[PDB]
Design a binder for this molecule. Structure first.
Ligand SMILES: CC(=O)SCCNC(=O)CCNC(=O)[C@H](O)C(C)(C)COP(=O)(O)OP(=O)(O)OC[C@H]1O[C@@H](n2cnc3c(N)ncnc32)[C@H](O)[C@@H]1OP(=O)(O)O
Ligand SMILES: CC(=O)SCCNC(=O)CCNC(=O)[C@H](O)C(C)(C)COP(=O)(O)OP(=O)(O)OC[C@H]1O[C@@H](n2cnc3c(N)ncnc32)[C@H](O)[C@@H]1OP(=O)(O)O
Ligand SMILES: [Ca+2]
Ligand SMILES: [Ca+2]
Ligand SMILES: [Ca+2]
Ligand SMILES: [Ca+2]
Ligand SMILES: [Ca+2]
Lengths: 164, 164
């Protein structure tokens, strides 16, 4: 009912994976491990940053968890405009929604963007996810040729890395 | 006769030049509002928001105007919470008169070695549907072709950042 928003620490990684998997579940599997998450976020070069919502013992989940929400983000670069904050995952446990946790994470995300001089914050939302679409729209969000996403998988990267 | 190397801060005027030539190629040169000063700050300060590789030619092959940089790639890392680290190819461009000589292939070898060193599972990138030469260029190297994007601008972010 009351809560604190703070940067994640390494000891939060198990809760982060649990919430990544709960958001995946809401959108739809997840093959990332706690160890990856730990190395990728808290090693020498962080590949993502996380804000976490923490509730007092009074309001811990039935399973005993203090962390009831999170956001995962990273920076991207638009070579026409400049740096962007990219919001990757954003989720509050179903029983703690509607009490301002979300809005507080978004204020903290907003602060990061201004500190870091991002012109905009970018994020994906599913078509069917109507409550989230309206929630974002209320806060200023607009929606954005025809350019296709391509990927080259590690087996082909390996081939090119190791040909001369 | 060419070397692929990491960009240095002194290469920023060339990077902007090639950013603009790629946007022209993509029918969108008028969108480029980035400056050389932004590139320098964003690329060559405390926190780089992109990385760049450049193709430099020797004196005997400099462009008619005298430039030694004839190609580049701009990249950054993103994070897929289901999978882990990804290498995201933002811009990839070789000046027309210097295409067909192995430069793009060699840039792609260097990108693939970044992905391997960094343990990225895949390299992701956008390709316009009209851009047939490049589509086939990438498909011959293993590329596979494979939800609404919202933004919140600076003024709305500042708004959320500064409220109780
Ligand atoms: C992942 C991405 O990058 S995009 C996808 C975003 N994530 C999701 O959709 C996952 C499911 N949803 C959620 O986890 C959350 O609802 C979030 C993250 C979207 C928002 O977090 P919350 O803590 O619920 O936000 P907060 O409490 O500040 O406000 C939510 C708003 O919805 C309303 N609301 C939320 N729950 C309820 C409810 N059960 N009944 C009535 N109204 C509700 C609130 O009144 C509030 O309204 P406002 O827009 O007028 O301020
Ligand atoms: C972010 C993005 O991905 S945006 C889209 C990419 N950019 C564009 O479309 C802009 C126009 N394109 C460019 O400027 C590009 O970098 C490209 C895509 C044209 C590639 O750069 P290039 O230097 O032309 O590539 P490179 O010269 O290595 O290879 C092109 C072809 O010539 C052949 N080739 C080049 N050099 C040699 C050589 N020395 N011996 C034999 N064959 C050669 C290659 O095999 C390749 O053909 P393939 O597809 O059959 O293998
Ligand atoms: Ca996500
Ligand atoms: Ca910053
Ligand atoms: Ca220069
Ligand atoms: Ca681009
Ligand atoms: Ca690395």
């Amino acid at each position: 009912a009351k809560f604190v928003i703070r940067p994640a620490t390494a000891a939060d990684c198990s809760d982060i994976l649990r919430l990544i998997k709960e958001l995946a579940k809401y959108e739809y599997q997840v093959i990332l491990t706690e160890k990856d998450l730990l190395e990728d976020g808290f090693g020498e070069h962080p590949f993502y940053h996380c804000l976490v919502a923490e509730v007092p013992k009074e309001h811990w989940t039935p399973e005993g968890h203090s962390i009831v929400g999170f956001a995962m983000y990273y920076f991207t670069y638009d070579p026409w405009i400049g740096k962007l904050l990219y919001l990757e995952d954003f989720f509050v446990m179903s029983d703690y929604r509607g009490f301002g946790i979300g809005s507080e994470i978004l204020k903290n995300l907003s602060q990061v963007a201004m500190r870091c001089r991002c012109s905009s914050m970018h994020f994906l939302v599913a078509e069917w996810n109507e409550p989230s679409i309206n929630f974002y729209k209320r806060r200023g969000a607009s929606d954005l040729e025809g350019w296709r996403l391509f990927k080259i998988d590690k087996e082909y990267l390996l081939k090119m890395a190791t040909e001369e």
